[PDB]
Design a binder for this molecule. Structure first.
Ligand SMILES: N[C@@H](C(=O)N[C@H]1CN([C@@H](C(=O)O)c2ccc(O)cc2)C1=O)c1ccc(O)cc1
Ligand SMILES: N[C@@H](C(=O)N[C@H]1CN([C@@H](C(=O)O)c2ccc(O)cc2)C1=O)c1ccc(O)cc1
Ligand SMILES: Nc1ncnc2c1ncn2[C@@H]1O[C@H](CSCC[C@H](N)C(=O)O)[C@@H](O)[C@H]1O
Ligand SMILES: Nc1ncnc2c1ncn2[C@@H]1O[C@H](CS)[C@@H](O)[C@H]1O
Lengths: 289, 286
């Protein structure tokens, strides 16, 4: 017996249906608010945050097909037992090449409300807070994948917090940020070696001059799909051959790992796990060929 | 390295992206005009017609994932050579449980836009010739013994008449929304009743075969197709057969039929040559 999960375009959230590429099948689930940043301790329930994190309890089933209608999207799956949910998730957590993706990220009415970002200090602290798990995982993981400093470039550095954490992990690395918003640059001048204002489609640094390129904005509610591709190409062109390009998102990343492959960017990592194994999140680490 | 097939919503045809499920392995293609009704011959090129038929040459690759964006739909896939296309297409022809479906059929602008003449009725019948010539035979092979046959959107009556030809003694009862269609169908069926299939013209669980050739792109919407399937399949006896086909893509999934208590015995049918496949959901009612 198959089952169906549905998200409508008007009131629903198609971008909350996620696929996990595990054991040569696709598992579908529906993101809800996760235990953040880590799992619940005894007598101390973790904050619940809608964010990059998905958990095993959010899984639903093994995908057979989808159906994309005039007013909703449906995924037909074989529902998973609660035990296999845990096992398949553990297997994903054990293998950072596991893809995690959101194929309807740009589908529906809510994402059309996208309109750079001039925010208050508190709003900026909230942006930073939802990327804490990312700032704690990626730097160490870049080291495990062989990064040894150099020049690091964030093509949409917002507050500068993320690239600042890369710099701290790798002493002597020059941190170069760029952001469309002048207000953001003002904030990042306090944390980066360089902070440039301008649309990332016109990169502020020369071609093949960066050892690491970071893009945390090619996401739903930030840019559109074709925009995300053009911005990836501009950012990746700043990476030298053999360098690393990293794509992350608080909201779903709009570029597929397949498109990355097509662009000559080899995925060395597609997802990351919290240290407890309780949650997974998109983490595309790509080698520039 | 993967490749990507795109259909845009404004000018593209997302309904022409088709998928084959050859035993868990998913293939994607783009439908073009097909050799109709059968393969090219020695000195005769076949007619080429945009219809229910797909061929191996229209396949593209092994599905990796899709991406349904704000202005287009994309499928990423591992490209296939023509020989492996034909090899995989052969295995599909050899297993009629293979699913053939069009998951973006109702996506985009073109699809968001029947009291016809005998010239139009004749063109309607022509694009369905390959279905009339081979589904009834297939139904015999699957054990259909006759009885009462009901077409919930009988149009001209040509299709349900082909059923009656194949199983003499079967009582043929058609319903159609269009009064003009009923007038044609009355000259081909035992009965022809005018009215929306949502109010079926025969009693519940009184038919041994129920036919729907209208739950499809450019005919009804998605919600309508599910409502009309429910009405039509209530007319089918337990152990009877529900058959869904379409010149244009069928909007109901075989998974939705299983959730509705209808077991797929077959999901696609092939031309006698094995040159082409068409959607052919034959469901046993539970
Ligand atoms: N302007 C901000 C904005 O539109 N938030 C929306 C998207 N969302 C949640 C929802 O709809 O359930 C959500 C959150 C995370 C997730 O993974 C999925 C859904 C909002 O709330 C914004 C802030 C930071 C950012 O990186 C991008 C956008
Ligand atoms: N009013 C007729 C109509 O709108 N035809 C449209 C759909 N189409 C072709 C196209 O768009 O390339 C096409 C044809 C078959 C196919 O499998 C895929 C695409 C048209 O032309 C009509 C006639 C019979 C019927 O059962 C339903 C609709
Ligand atoms: N075309 C573009 N070029 C450079 N920066 C851009 C851009 N489009 C959006 N941005 C920047 O991307 C940032 C949002 S990325 C989403 C926020 C992220 N989670 C965070 O923690 O900061 C904003 O600062 C915005 O100014
Ligand atoms: N709700 C409905 N009930 C019965 N017939 C219907 C219908 N909607 C469309 N049709 C009928 O199906 C045919 C096109 S394939 C045509 O003869 C039309 O009158």
């Amino acid at each position: 017996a198959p089952d169906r999960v549905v998200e409508t375009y008007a009131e629903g959230k198609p971008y909350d249906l996620f696929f996990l590429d595990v054991a040569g099948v696709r598992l579908v689930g529906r993101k809800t608010e996760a235990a953040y940043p880590g799992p619940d301790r005894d007598g101390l329930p973790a904050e619940r945050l809608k964010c990059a994190l998905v958990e095993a309890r959010m899984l639903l089933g093994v995908v057979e097909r989808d159906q994309v209608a005039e007013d909703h999207v449906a995924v037909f799956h074989r529902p998973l037992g609660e035990a296999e949910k845990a096992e398949l998730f553990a297997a994903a957590v054990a293998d950072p090449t596991t893809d995690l993706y959101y194929p309807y990220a740009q589908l529906g009415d809510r994402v059309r409300e996208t309109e750079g970002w001039e925010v208050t200090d508190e709003s900026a602290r909230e942006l930073d807070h939802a990327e804490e798990v990312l700032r704690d995982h990626v730097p160490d993981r870049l080291a495990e994948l062989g990064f040894r400093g150099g020049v690091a470039y964030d093509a949409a550095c917002s507050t500068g917090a993320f690239l600042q954490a890369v710099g701290r992990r790798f002493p002597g690395t020059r941190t170069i940020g760029q952001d469309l918003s002048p207000a953001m640059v003002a904030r990042a001048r306090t944390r980066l070696d360089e902070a440039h204002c301008g649309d990332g489609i016109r990169p502020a640094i020369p071609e093949a001059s960066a050892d690491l390129v970071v893009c945390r904005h090619l996401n739903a509610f930030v840019v559109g799909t074709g925009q995300a591709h053009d911005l990836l190409a501009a950012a990746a062109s700043r990476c030298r051959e053999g360098g690393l390009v990293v794509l992350l998102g608080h909201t779903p990343v709009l570029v597929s790992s397949q498109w990355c492959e097509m662009s000559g960017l080899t995925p060395l990592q597609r997802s990351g796990a919290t240290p407890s194994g309780h949650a997974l999140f998109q983490c595309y680490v790509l080698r520039k060929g």
